[PDB]
């Protein structure tokens, strides 16, 4: 049987799928994530602040 990928298939997004939230997913915290500090963030935290010292 043809072992190759099949061109001639619908390349468009499919507007026929459950559009609702899926209540069947692991609801628990995920113990498989980088636990380190992540050195990839803006070190200049100054574009947005409350001009009033108090809120």
């Amino acid at each position, epitope marked *: 049987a043809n072992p190759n990928a099949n061109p001639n298939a619908n390349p468009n997004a499919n507007p026929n799928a459950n559009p609702n939230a899926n209540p069947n997913a692991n609801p628990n915290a995920n113990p498989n994530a980088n636990p380190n*500090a992540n*050195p*990839n963030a803006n*070190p*200049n935290a*100054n574009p947005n602040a409350n001009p009033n010292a108090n809120p």
Partner: antibody
Amino acid sequence: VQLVESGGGVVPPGRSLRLSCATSGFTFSNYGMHWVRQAPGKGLEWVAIIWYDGSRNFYAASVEGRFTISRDNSKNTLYLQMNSLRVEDTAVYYCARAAYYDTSGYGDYWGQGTLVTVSS
Amino acid sequence: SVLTQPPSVSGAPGQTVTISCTGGSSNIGAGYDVHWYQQLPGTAPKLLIYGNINRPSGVPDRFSGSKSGTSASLAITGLQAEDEADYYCQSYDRRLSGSWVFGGGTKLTVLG
């Protein structure tokens, strides 16, 4: 914006050297800083970053634990204290002003650097 | 060397030359923005390109950038004698502890 560097020179291996990047033309206290280095004849290597308020610091793996980065915001000055210098640390060190775009950061102004030589 | 750059590029003044930089799924194809710096023989690198395509107002409109998958790019049109320089790419490698990673640089020689 202007960054000025001083502190290079020849130091016997094992000894320390301090670099100092004097700055002006911007509010030093509102920006983080970087150091990079370039050994003669080599390309660029990132060395360290310090957050605008000193709340977070990161080091290249090859220098972590030997180098200390700090800021004296009141003097508009960035420092790099290198202890236990090795011959392999010979390089022009440069300071740069941290900048950030979207998914990654960058430098948007560079100092001129100074040459640190470690030699017997 | 984290990002891969060819060691050399050249052409005559008036010609178009390009400088490439290829990464992997951890640094360029990873969605991290690629930046470019130009270093002249007696000084520090200068920001040439940022955000893959943009550039400082201090850069002549002779330079521009791009990106496709893991391949980043710098194009120089209207090559001048004054473009002799070391061109470096920069990105962020999610597998490493450093804020910035660099390629080894490409040496541009203008055949003047």
